[PDB]
Each structure stands twice: as structure tokens, then as C-alpha cells.
Design a protein around this ligand. Structure first.
Ligand SMILES: *Cc1cc2c(cc1C)nc1c(=O)[nH]c(=O)nc-1n2C[C@H](O)[C@H](O)[C@H](O)COP(=O)(O)OP(=O)(O)OC[C@H]1O[C@@H](n2cnc3c(N)ncnc32)[C@H](O)[C@@H]1O
Ligand SMILES: [N+]
Length: 478
């Protein structure tokens, strides 16, 4: 039986808002669950109601209201963030972590308490375990280890019916694989067990500028396809504007220019783990071998050494900056997508060069991934193709709020135009963090994976109580 009191221990949380600032909602209530028991109690009660919906909120970083429950119940999963933490040995190591824990705190705790760390990250660490595992969780390690959803050995899940189940690849495996990349549709992740690696002492962080997309992409693909023993430990890249803009021009590139008609340029971003047992000269020798033959513009290679924790935490500086400029609690109509290797050059021509040649005010990430690291059994949707290589693209728009900058309607319209152009060109792409309004568009997104997705919904959340903000299924009555 669900027993609740007024929240005393907690600061105000705007449960009807998220990072995107595109939508707003008015939940009936915000609940701070103590742990999995409370989550189950809440979902069991929701199932008995005629039409209550429940959204589990991670850290509110959705763009499109995915963690909202207008006229429903929001669970603050961070109130469970301390639950379950442990490190165990089998001599491989694992961590149990709460679904509501921030990746930032997992990094700090694992490194400081055990000299260990997760091996697959997001760029930004104030995201929750459950939140990223429900999507994928992608950064520069994914070419080696796969996304965070490919680095899980166990989940505790409370289903939309309110049932608690421990799941793995071999136990309640339909739920396990369904929840991974499953957009919160089948249950609330209350615990994950994840592999850990010995934490590196240090990182050599490198950025190299490219004039042309062909050179950039060929070199990026080369670097993610080398033997593990002779490879970097992180590969990303981004297009930036050939301008003096502090937001997304040349100032955004160095870690601590040639005058040309280029509208955009490209930056290949690499990192090499090393330990204090390695001399600077040794690291130099390794890097020199690894980048032999690369066609980056001479004179525009930037390098710094920093601790592993500082490198994984590198985006904290960006948040501090934004917050100091009152730009954090503002709209961010970001667009994220996966593009097939076969179509990435046309995507660059049509979208980067064609539509975005003046930039979007923030990073335009683009870098290759390896399909073999993305578990085909999961709910993740990738574009068709069987090139081992595919790409992720992220358009991290940043603008002063209206009327100083464009309206949210305007920006969303621009995002729609990008997607429209890809569709009209028949490009092989899928949205990451997908958002659609009609189920017809959702069926187009899932393609031949749709039947399985609905089957899982019927098995685990038949009344569609859970994650209504994804707008895939509507709440059934009674
Ligand atoms: C805001 C932001 C997001 C972001 C990022 C940088 C910033 C500043 N960098 C990313 C990166 O480098 N790589 C990547 O893959 N994602 C990145 N993101 C996006 C982030 O992944 C998403 O915002 C994602 O949603 C995680 O954020 P968060 O943890 O805050 O979760 P949420 O937005 O509130 O909820 C997402 C959906 O999942 C459901 N949900 C939430 N918690 C659970 C649990 N425990 N179990 C089951 N479902 C859950 C929500 O209801 C919602 O549908
Ligand atoms: N070097």
C-alpha cells in the first residue's frame, strides 16, 4: 500500500519542464520514491486507476517532453540515486548502480573508492543510468565498447503493471533487451549492473582540424577500425563554423587561423589513455605512430594532458559557462540522428553544407560508430545497411531566448526541414532520442521492429501507463 507525505528533504523540482524547453506540462504530482518498492507501489496504483499515467524522470535532459506526464504522476528517480551501490569481483569487476544515479557520481565514486570506472560514457555526465540506458548512451568509447546499453549485465525493472523483475540476457531476457533502448515503454529501471575497467591515470586529448569532409570522414573511419592494441581510446568529431564566433566558431576548437572561403570546417577529436608509468616521450611515440598519414591541416593540431576524471568530466566547464550566461535554463531544440555510412557524404552536402553552413550556435557532432557493438536484440533502432560503419550526428542548437534569438516554433520548424530533406532524399537515417506525434510516424521509425515493440508493450505495459511523453502509445482506460 502506497504511503506518502509532503516532501521535506527536497528542493523544488520543475517536473513539468525539461532541458529542451519545447513543451511544458502540469503533472498531478511529483513523487520522490525511496526505491524500487515505492516505484512498484506507484505503478500498481496507477494500473488500478481509470487512466493515470506515470513518467520516470531522470535528470530532466529530454528535449521533447519524453519524461513528462501531463495530468499524471512524475517519479523523481534521483531520490533513489544512492540505492544499490556496490562493487563486486568475479577477476573482472562490476558495479551495481541505481537507475536514478548520475553517471558523474558513478565516475567519481568508482575511481576514488576502487580505481575503477565504467568503460562507455556519455559526453555529459549529469544524466541518469535509467535515462541513458533507455536510449543508448553514446560517446567516443562506443566504437570500442558499444553504447552504454551494450554494457549491462543485469537490470532490476518495475514493469508498467508494477511487477519487480531482475533481468539479464538469460533471465526475463525479453524485458532486459526490451528495456535497453526501449524509451521507458516497458518498465522503470531501478538498478543496473555494469562492467568496470581499471581507470587510466591520464588522457592525451587531441583535436585536429580538417578542411574537407572527405578527408575527415576517411580518417575517422580509419581510426575506429584499427586493432584495439594500436588504437585511440576515444574518437569523436564535429563540424564548426569558419568564423570568430565564441559559440561555435574557431574559438570553440582549441583545448587551452587560415583565411579561406570555407563556411564550415571539421574537427577530429581523439584521446589516448595512459598511466603515470608512461613517459611523455612514450606517449608521444605512440601518438605519432597512430596519426601517421592522417590528412589534418598542419599547424592545427591541439593537444593537452589531463587526468582521466578531468577528461570524462570535460563538459562540466561548458555547463558552468552556460549557467553563468543564463543560457542553461533556456530552450535547447536539439536534433540527434544516426546516418548510414552509405549516405553520410550526401548528408554532409545537403544538411551541413546546404542548410547549416552558418552553424546552429553549438557543436554539430558527427562521427563514426561500429554496428557490431550495438546489440541487435535491444530496442535501439539503427538505419538499415550492413556496412560495419555508421554515423551519429548531433545538432546542439544554442540561441539567446526569443525575441533576442529565434522562437522555439522557428527552431523546431528548422529541425523539421532537416528531417524532411533527408526523407525526400531517401537518406538512410533514424532519429536518436526519436520524437514523433502520430503512431503512423512511429511505425515508420521502428520499421520491421514495430511488431516486436508492440508485443513487448502488451506484455509489460498493456494499459500504456508508463512514459506517455514518448507519445508512442496512448493510455487505455479502466
Ligand atoms: C541535456 C543533455 C543531454 C544529453 C547530453 C548533454 C546534455 C547537456 N549528452 C549526451 C551524450 O553525450 N550522449 C548521449 O547518448 N545522450 C546525451 N544526452 C541525452 C540523454 O541521453 C537524454 O536526455 C536521456 O533522456 C537521458 O537523460 P535523463 O537521465 O535526464 O533522462 P530523462 O530525459 O529524464 O528521461 C528519458 C526518458 O527515459 C525515461 N526514464 C527516465 N528514467 C528512467 C528509468 N530509471 N527507467 C526507465 N525509464 C526511465 C523517461 O521517462 C524518459 O522517457
Ligand atoms: N605528437
Amino acid at each position: 500500500s502506497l504511503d506518502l507525505q509532503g516532501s521535506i528533504d527536497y528542493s523544488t523540482l520543475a517536473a513539468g519542464k525539461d532541458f529542451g524547453g519545447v513543451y511544458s506540462s502540469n503533472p498531478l504530482a511529483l513523487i520522490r520514491p525511496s526505491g524500487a518498492d515505492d516505484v512498484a507501489r506507484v505503478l500498481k496504483s496507477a494500473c488500478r486507476s481509470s487512466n493515470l499515467t506515470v513518467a520516470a524522470r531522470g535528470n530532466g535532459h529530454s528535449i521533447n517532453g519524453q519524461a513528462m506526464a501531463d495530468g499524471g504522476i512524475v517519479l523523481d528517480m534521483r531520490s533513489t540515486e544512492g540505492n544499490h551501490f556496490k562493487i563486486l569481483r568475479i577477476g573482472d569487476h562490476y558495479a551495481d548502480v541505481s537507475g536514478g544515479a548520475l553517471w558523474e557520481d558513478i565516475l567519481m565514486r568508482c575511481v576514488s573508492e576502487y580505481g575503477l570506472a565504467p568503460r562507455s560514457w556519455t559526453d555529459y555526465l549529469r544524466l541518469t543510468v535509467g535515462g541513458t540506458l533507455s536510449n543508448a548512451g553514446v560517446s567516443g568509447q562506443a566504437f570500442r565498447y558499444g553504447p552504454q546499453s551494450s554494457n549491462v549485465t543485469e537490470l532490476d525493472v518495475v514493469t508498467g503493471k508494477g511487477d519487480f523483475l531482475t533481468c539479464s540476457p538469460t533471465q526475463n531476457s525479453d524485458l532486459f533487451f526490451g528495456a535497453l533502448g526501449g524509451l521507458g515503454q516497458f518498465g522503470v529501471i531501478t538498478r543496473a549492473r555494469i562492467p568496470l575497467e581499471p581507470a587510466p591515470d591520464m588522457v592525451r586529448w587531441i583535436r585536429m582540424v580538417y578542411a574537407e569532409f572527405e578527408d575527415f570522414s576517411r580518417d575517422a573511419e580509419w581510426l575506429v577500425t584499427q586493432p584495439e592494441k594500436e588504437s585511440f581510446d576515444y574518437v569523436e568529431g564535429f563540424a564548426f563554423v569558419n568564423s570568430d564566433s565564441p559559440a561555435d566558431g574557431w574559438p570553440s576548437v582549441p583545448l587551452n587561423p587560415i583565411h579561406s572561403g570555407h563556411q564550415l570546417l571539421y574537427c577530429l577529436e581523439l584521446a589516448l589513455h595512459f598511466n603515470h608509468s608512461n613517459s611523455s616521450s612514450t606517449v608521444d611515440s605512440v601518438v605519432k605512430r597512430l596519426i601517421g598519414g592522417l590528412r589534418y591541416m598542419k599547424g592545427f593540431k591541439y593537444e593537452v594532458d589531463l587526468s582521466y576524471v578531468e577528461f570524462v568530466m570535460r563538459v562540466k566547464r561548458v555547463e558552468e559557462d552556460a549557467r553563468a550566461h543564463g543560457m542553461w535554463d533556456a530552450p535547447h531544440p536539439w536534433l540527434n540522428l544516426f546516418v548510414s555510412k552509405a549516405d553520410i557524404a550526401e548528408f554532409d552536402r545537403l544538411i551541413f553544407k546546404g542548410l547549416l553552413h552558418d552553424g546552429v550556435g553549438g557543436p554539430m557532432l558527427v562521427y563514426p560508430l561500429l554496428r557490431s557493438k550495438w546489440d541487435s536484440r535491444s530496442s535501439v533502432v539503427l538505419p538499415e545497411g550492413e556496412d560495419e560503419i555508421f554515423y551519429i550526428v548531433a545538432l546542439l542548437r544554442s540561441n539567446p531566448p526569443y525575441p533576442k534569438g529565434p522562437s522555439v516554433d522557428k527552431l523546431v520548424s528548422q529541425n523539421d526541414k532537416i528531417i524532411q530533406s533527408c526523407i525526400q532524399h531517401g537518406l538512410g537515417f533514424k532519429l536518436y532520442l526519436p520524437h514523433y506525434q502520430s503512431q503512423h510516424d512511429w511505425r515508420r521509425h521502428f520499421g520491421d521492429q514495430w511488431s516486436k515493440f508492440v508485443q513487448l508493450k502488451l506484455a509489460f505495459d498493456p494499459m500504456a501507463v508508463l512514459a506517455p511523453g514518448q507519445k508512442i502509445f496512448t493510455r487505455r482506460t479502466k
